[PDB]
Write a protein that binds this DNA or RNA. Structure first.
Ligand SMILES: Nc1ncnc2c1ncn2[C@@H]1O[C@H](COP(=O)(O)OP(=O)(O)NP(=O)(O)O)[C@@H](O)[C@H]1O
Ligand SMILES: Nc1ncnc2c1ncn2[C@@H]1O[C@H](COP(=O)(O)OP(=O)(O)NP(=O)(O)O)[C@@H](O)[C@H]1O
Ligand SMILES: Nc1ncnc2c1ncn2[C@@H]1O[C@H](COP(=O)(O)OP(=O)(O)NP(=O)(O)O)[C@@H](O)[C@H]1O
Ligand SMILES: [Mg+2]
Ligand SMILES: [Mg+2]
Ligand SMILES: [Mg+2]
Lengths: 306, 307, 302
DNA sequence: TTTCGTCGCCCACGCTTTTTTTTTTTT
């Protein structure tokens, strides 16, 4: 995550760097990942200047066929934040993978928010316990953030109550556009420190409301595609683990409320089901590296256990 | 908290403010909540000055990344409107919470409207009962709004009828769009006043007959979702606690709340009420992000919810 | 009851009013209380006209909210037709509450049906009401019972007891139009109450079959939605009646449809001899108890 | 030293939504 000032020393002046920063490119990776057609619509950058900055950005960010034994080593070195439950972290063959998107969908009262709250504390656990030793981004679009759960999880894990709530940074999206701006601000502020997680609670819930009718289906899917592409860019350029949450719909018998856009974009999906009492069930979905099966986890006072 | 007028103090000419208010944006926070898609939809407001409506309003609200310590400090500010029972209080850990939606569902005679009446009384009461201050907003379609029960509940709490029944409203229109329109109007009603509880009992009772048959289900569910979302906006913007009771359907494949998968997610708290013995009922916390899976027996009496 | 000439003299002056009257939902309260979908299939296709009529006919008793004391006073002067017995002066808190939706069950054709051929004591007494109804789904209405009951009190008149009580209904799709057209004479003259004898008694006589049960339940939901609309708009006390099912797992026909579309339901049981013990059920402001009724050849009371 | 002319050419698809609804007594 090299800051945007890295290319400032090489060619690009301060004015252009400021224009990029106000555009939303707070890192060299964000500039390098964007196409040439996107570094043109932002005023203040010429076409030749755009090609120049693209060349300089590509000088540091690795692209193309370079080496893949190193990438296999990197995949073996994936952080794999643990869920906190012995069956959820085993069904996922380690837990939530980092650098990808882990959508979880269920009917209701299925433990999606409970899992997010547990992960917001477990991402601060060292690699010995399973985590990333970093902060926790919490984009919460339902007003469903209860720090008491985080304190309970921390006291279960024997961590300081003040530390976990100091690490966790919280923001609430009020619409889809504001969700995108919140994502941009998160990208801006994720370079100043290390963030081991990024939670988008009900990543597609305001889409169900803001876009009404069939006439807005294409625009809604395009906006959701842009949002998921931005989330993927955050996942690669930062190495964070994005655990987004999805709702469910009935086939007029359940299916995630996102179309094929979110089905393809989401690297992993989890189907959460209500079991008996406090226990629930989790099933893998659309995971290219995981089998299809079920799990067995419970919602205790200490987040998610068994 | 603050009026819409501040927007025209920032440098937008009053005609644009009146156009924004005509669409329903009776507060600066409300217009900030809506995205640019809902701002371009206002007639006479194009993409021009849209930034002057978005970022100028956003400069007056946080709309950013706080810390969890600050949110936990704000968590003490919550009023936590209190019920009438001590066991029920232990169930909800102090009572229903401020700025959230509680949906209570069950069969007939499960104490729903009694809970609504008692909660509105505690909202029209000092902090000693559990609610800070504010009027009680009623939105009745099922028809159980009998001010006889309001008068009866007023005797136990020792409040004169002049200052309680004149402080509570009523809904006359039995239409799905009527509740949304009346809540948009209650927005401007409450921006000039203070409110603590907002009750919409027939949250999904209207949709059982308004949209009948498979084929019209989708439009019904988009309508319900839009109503729920603007209800959540109203709850958050003014820190009001919302109650929305629900009906049940028997699974013929055994009672399930109606309008599922749309009201299930939106309702941040769900209370499942069962009939017990005599007149006592049992309230179980169906859905909650903080409260456990507990059950509390209460006994509706003349005083109120009772225990 | 607001049959004001404003409904036709407003900005809308065209065939739209006559289309609305012919569609079966007339009077102004058929507009501001009706969804937009109903104003689609009616003859005359204009979505702009829907909101035009809505704007021009939403100017009624406060619909842009109100205060609860304004109609709390209105329901302090409410009729509240007292029951035809002096034993229920403690229970029921007076009489049959007007503007509510009371439900009776426990019997098939006797019992609660007798409670249809009685009461109206407040109607006879002071002015006053002097009005009563009768609807049916599968019933055996007998006006001689009304004659005998009125003769018990000081209401000795004969013709005044007639020309009000409907006595029709055998098949659901037959009395669909009956409950549609009730308003056609309900607004011409003011009116007190409305019993629906054997209402939605056994829909499985015609609306029968698995898979069909859902459509049946939608039909009942529509019917009591209209019934609630009429009860609240005209300020009348409606009495729905059903029959038991003998649970094999003491409940009435209707399931969760009429269960969530009533106000003051109350079970009717059998006592000793002519004693018809009348227990109570869900009610916003009535403590649970059991009443004591009696039926005799003269009528219901004692 | 002199003195302007003269139009042609089409491309190219995107996007799912949404649950309802209880009968029925034997011996
Ligand atoms: N302290 C606690 N102890 C035990 N269980 C709890 C506790 N707090 C919450 N729960 C359980 O967690 C459930 C809610 O889980 P949640 O993660 O909010 O579901 P969800 O699928 O996110 N629902 P929604 O967000 O409305 O779509 C509750 O209904 C309880 O069963
Ligand atoms: N006008 C009336 N006056 C007095 N008694 C009446 C009158 N009408 C009906 N009854 C009584 O009601 C009785 C009906 O039989 P009952 O023993 O109640 O049958 P049930 O099976 O208990 N009732 P149901 O549930 O309607 O089938 C008659 O036989 C009479 O005793
Ligand atoms: N004074 C009282 N004393 C004791 N219990 C009471 C009293 N008033 C009301 N109750 C009880 O509280 C219940 C509240 O029911 P209510 O909340 O009206 O159900 P509902 O689901 O809204 N009705 P419906 O429209 O038929 O589905 C009553 O039915 C009684 O059981
Ligand atoms: Mg959950
Ligand atoms: Mg109730
Ligand atoms: Mg009968």
């Amino acid at each position: 995550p090299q800051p945007i000032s890295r290319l400032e020393q090489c060619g690009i002046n301060a004015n252009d760097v400021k224009k990029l920063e106000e555009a939303g490119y707070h890192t060299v990776e964000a500039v390098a990942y964007a196409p040439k057609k996107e570094l043109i619509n932002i005023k203040g950058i010429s076409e030749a200047k755009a090609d120049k900055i693209l060349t300089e950005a590509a000088k540091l960010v690795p692209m193309g066929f370079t080496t893949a034994t190193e990438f296999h080593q990197r995949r073996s070195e994936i952080i794999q934040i643990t869920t906190g439950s012995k069956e959820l972290d085993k069904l996922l063959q380690g837990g939530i993978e980092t650098g990808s998107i882990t959508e979880m969908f269920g009917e209701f009262r299925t433990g999606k928010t409970q899992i997010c709250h547990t992960l917001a504390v477990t991402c601060q656990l060292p690699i010995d316990r399973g985590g990333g030793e970093g902060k926790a981004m919490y984009i919460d679009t339902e007003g469903t953030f209860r720090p008491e759960r985080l304190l309970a999880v921390a006291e279960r894990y024997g961590l300081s109550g003040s530390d976990v709530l100091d690490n966790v940074a919280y923001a609430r999206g009020f619409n889809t556009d504001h969700q995108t701006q919140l994502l941009y601000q998160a990208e801006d502020m994720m370079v100043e420190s290390r963030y081991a997680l990024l939670i988008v609670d009900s990543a597609t819930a305001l889409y169900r409301t803001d876009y009404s009718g069939r006439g807005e289906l294409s625009a809604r899917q395009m906006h959701l595609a842009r949002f998921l592409r931005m989330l993927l860019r955050l996942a690669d350029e930062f190495g964070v683990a994005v655990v987004i949450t999805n709702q469910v719909v009935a086939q007029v018998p359940k299916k995630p409320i996102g179309g094929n856009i979110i089905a393809h974009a989401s690297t992993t999906r989890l189907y959460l089901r209500k079991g008996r009492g406090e226990t629930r069930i989790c099933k893998i979905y659309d995971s290219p590296c995981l089998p299809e099966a079920e799990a067995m986890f419970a919602i205790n006072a200490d987040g998610v256990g068994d």
